[PDB]
């Protein structure tokens, strides 16, 4: 029974921790990349994420 709770909590924690990955974007923060990069190429950056 404890393993079900552990596995669900772990999968969910991994799912949220994936938001810190850049995937090749200049930065993982959408507002940070959007705030300094012009739309025609901020689109390219945001697509990877």
């Amino acid at each position: 029974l404890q393993d079900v709770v552990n596995q669900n909590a772990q999968a969910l924690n991994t799912l949220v921790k994936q938001l810190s990955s850049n995937f090749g974007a200049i930065s993982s923060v959408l507002n940070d990349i959007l705030s300094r990069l012009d739309p025609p190429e901020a689109e390219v950056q945001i697509d990877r994420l």
Binding site: P39, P40, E41
Partner: protein
Amino acid sequence: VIRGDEVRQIAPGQTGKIADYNYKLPDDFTGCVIAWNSNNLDSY
């Protein structure tokens, strides 16, 4: 009529006086841009 200095600005996703105050093209423009020197005809 435009001047060769910043004539390249007539294009999607460009910045400058022309593209930001005079004539701005959309990002998904579909079509062709044509230019030619007109010194013999146009040269305040």
